Design an enzyme around this catalytic site. Structure first.
Site, PDB file in Angstrom:
ATOM      1  N   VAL A  86       1.550   5.146  -7.713  1.00  0.00           N
ATOM      2  CA  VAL A  86       2.836   4.834  -7.840  1.00  0.00           C
ATOM      3  C   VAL A  86       3.284   3.348  -7.064  1.00  0.00           C
ATOM      4  CG1 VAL A  86       5.431   5.468  -7.255  1.00  0.00           C
ATOM      5  CG2 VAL A  86       4.103   6.749  -8.973  1.00  0.00           C
ATOM      6  N   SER A  99       1.751   0.836  -3.501  1.00  0.00           N
ATOM      7  CA  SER A  99       1.289   0.708  -2.291  1.00  0.00           C
ATOM      8  C   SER A  99       2.236  -0.018  -1.248  1.00  0.00           C
ATOM      9  CB  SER A  99      -0.159   0.202  -1.930  1.00  0.00           C
ATOM     10  OG  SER A  99      -1.062   1.105  -2.605  1.00  0.00           O
ATOM     11  N   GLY A 100       1.801  -0.218  -0.083  1.00  0.00           N
ATOM     12  CA  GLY A 100       2.561  -1.032   0.994  1.00  0.00           C
ATOM     13  C   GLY A 100       2.363  -0.592   2.338  1.00  0.00           C
ATOM     14  N   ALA A 101       3.355  -1.121   3.259  1.00  0.00           N
ATOM     15  CA  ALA A 101       3.228  -0.707   4.974  1.00  0.00           C
ATOM     16  C   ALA A 101       3.397   0.751   4.984  1.00  0.00           C
ATOM     17  CB  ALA A 101       4.046  -1.570   5.398  1.00  0.00           C
ATOM     18  N   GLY A 121       2.296   3.025   3.206  1.00  0.00           N
ATOM     19  CA  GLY A 121       1.300   3.757   2.730  1.00  0.00           C
ATOM     20  C   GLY A 121       1.240   3.884   1.282  1.00  0.00           C
ATOM     21  N   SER A 122       0.100   4.229   0.715  1.00  0.00           N
ATOM     22  CA  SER A 122       0.034   4.569  -0.744  1.00  0.00           C
ATOM     23  C   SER A 122       0.446   5.961  -1.174  1.00  0.00           C
ATOM     24  CB  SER A 122      -1.441   4.658  -1.035  1.00  0.00           C
ATOM     25  OG  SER A 122      -2.373   3.709  -0.567  1.00  0.00           O
ATOM     26  N   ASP A 160      14.365   7.506   3.383  1.00  0.00           N
ATOM     27  CA  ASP A 160      13.541   6.313   3.919  1.00  0.00           C
ATOM     28  C   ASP A 160      14.655   5.871   5.262  1.00  0.00           C
ATOM     29  OD1 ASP A 160      11.887   4.185   4.195  1.00  0.00           O
ATOM     30  OD2 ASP A 160      12.100   3.485   1.913  1.00  0.00           O
TER      31      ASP A 160
END
Lengths: 338, 8
Positions: free
Chosen positions: A27, A29-31, A33-34, A165
């Site tokens: 779905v 990725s990014g800082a 995480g995946s 978040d």
């Protein structure tokens, strides 16, 4: 009672998860995480499985990973994201490398809701109530979310909401005293955010959609008036006070002229949330007793949190000591009841 | 909240 894991490669990422988590679909990725969407065969829910990227590559990252796991493990409230599961494939600390977090997969955020229907005034009451309900709990553990905005608010078909978040269009919901670093900020920085969210749900417009920080600050000060003496005295930066003193003074607007046609109780609560001086903003707990929430306020169903010990923040530790503390938090995790 | 909110 260590589960059976199975190992697979999706994208360029390797996923080693217990076999209770099926049909892993990436779905993004990014800082952070995946993340894969998956099916939890033990609870029957659709879940998000988040694999942290490089959780222990520096002192900074290892401490950040520990801070995140402590915080997520403490959040137990129906209006706050909770940790369904945390696991590692590692059988020992010496093998310990990867951290996976599991949450209920959220099907829509507040923006997706607004894009599919017109909310009634009752919908807005319930959404805001639940934000404030969750914040009372968060703030009662001396946590500040710092980044409330519609994309961090999950909503289901029953109009039930969860705060997602936790921190560490991006600036539009941020309080002015942290947008420009005026002072050490209290938890009423989140109340400002709720105000911006609430005004947007009522009018259908972003309240303060400035481009840069200065443009934004002027839209804020046009509505709420320029700082008065008592607030200036609370601003640490000499340069900030000098900039503020250079502005042509502006009086607070009459909100009833800005929000024409909204429930006057809604407007009244917004006036109490969007106060420039954070010391005079309404708190989450006071805001729940506001007449606007009379259909939903229940003082015996607005719980607070257990005390949250953050004394680890001032510990100065080795990268492997942060990594060892995180491992303890992984192995000591108890799942929620169901 | 009784009637179902629409989801995309």
């Amino acid at each position: 009672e260590r589960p059976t894991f199975y190992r697979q490669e999706l994208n360029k990422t390797i996923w080693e998860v217990p076999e209770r988590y099926q049909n892993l679909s990436p779905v993004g990725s990014g800082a952070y995480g995946s993340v894969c969407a998956a099916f939890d065969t033990k609870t029957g829910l659709r879940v998000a499985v988040r694999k942290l990227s490089r959780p222990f590559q520096s002192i900074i990252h290892a401490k950040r990973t520990y801070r995140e796991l402590r915080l997520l493990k403490h959040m137990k409230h129906e209006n706050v994201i909770g940790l369904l599961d945390v696991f590692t494939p590692a059988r020992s600390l010496e093998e310990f490398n990867d951290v996976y977090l599991v949450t209920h997969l959220m099907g829509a955020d507040l923006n997706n809701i607004v894009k599919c229907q017109k909310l009634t005034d009752d919908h807005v009451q319930f959404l805001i109530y639940q934000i404030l309900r969750g914040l009372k709990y968060i703030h009662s553990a001396d946590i500040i979310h710092r980044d409330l905005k519609p994309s961090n608010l999950a909503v289901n078909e029953d109009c039930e909401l969860k705060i997602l978040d936790f921190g560490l269009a991006t600036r539009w919901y941020r309080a002015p005293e942290i947008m420009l670093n005026w002072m050490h900020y209290n938890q009423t920085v989140d109340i400002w955010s709720v105000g911006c969210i609430m005004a947007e749900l009522l009018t259908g417009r972003t309240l303060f959609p400035g481009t840069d920080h200065i443009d934004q600050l002027k839209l804020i000060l046009r509505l709420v008036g320029t700082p008065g003496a008592e607030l200036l005295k609370k601003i640490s930066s000499e340069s900030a006070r000098n900039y503020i003193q250079s502005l042509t003074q502006m009086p607070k607007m009459n909100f009833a002229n800005v929000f024409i046609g909204a429930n006057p109780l809604a407007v009244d609560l917004l006036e109490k949330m969007l106060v420039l001086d954070s010391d005079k903003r309404i708190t989450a707990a006071q805001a729940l007793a506001h007449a606007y929430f009379a259909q939903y306020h229940d003082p015996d169903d607005e719980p607070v949190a257990d005390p949250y010990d953050q004394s680890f923040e001032s510990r100065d530790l080795l990268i492997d000591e942060w990594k060892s503390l995180t491992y303890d938090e992984v192995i000591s995790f108890v799942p929620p009841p169901l | 909240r009784n009637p179902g909110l629409k989801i995309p």
